[PDB]
Curated annotation (Swiss-Prot):
Source superkingdom: Viruses
Protein name, per record: Protease NS2
Residues passing through the membrane, by range: 4-24
Job description of the protein: Cysteine protease required for the proteolytic auto-cleavage between the non-structural proteins NS2 and NS3. The N-terminus of NS3 is required for the function of NS2 protease (active region NS2-3). Promotes the initiation of viral particle assembly by mediating the interaction between structural and non-structural proteins.
Coiled coil: none
Protein's membrane topology: Multi-pass membrane protein
Annotated compartments: Host endoplasmic reticulum membrane; Host lipid droplet
Co-factor(s): Zn(2+)
Subunit composition and interactions: Homodimer. Interacts with envelope glycoprotein E1. Interacts with envelope glycoprotein E2. Interacts with viroporin p7. Interacts with serine protease/helicase NS3. Part of the replication complex composed of NS2, NS3, NS4A, NS4B, NS5A and the RNA-directed RNA polymerase embedded in an ER-derived membranous web. Part of the viral assembly initiation complex composed of NS2, E1, E2, NS3, NS4A, NS5A and the core protein.
Cofactor note: Activity of protease NS2 is dependent on zinc ions and completely inhibited by EDTA. This is probably due to the fact that NS2 protease activity needs NS3 N-terminus that binds a zinc atom (active region NS2-3).
Domain statement: The N-terminus of NS3 is required for the catalytic activity of protease NS2. The minimal catalytic region includes the C-terminus of NS2 and the N-terminus NS3 protease domain (active region NS2-3).
Shown segment, full-protein numbering: 734 to 764 of 2864
Originating organism: Hepatitis GB virus B (GBV-B)
Length: 31
């Protein structure tokens, strides 16, 4: 039963690793 809410019960260390990964590909780009 998860239409809009999936899993927002995570620690700050996990969310921090996800944010840095997003910026990594944005700066590295397909090169």
């Amino acid at each position: 039963d998860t239409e809009i809410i999936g899993g927002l019960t995570i620690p700050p260390v996990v969310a921090l690793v996800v944010m840095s990964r997003f910026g990594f590909f944005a700066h590295l780009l397909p090169r």
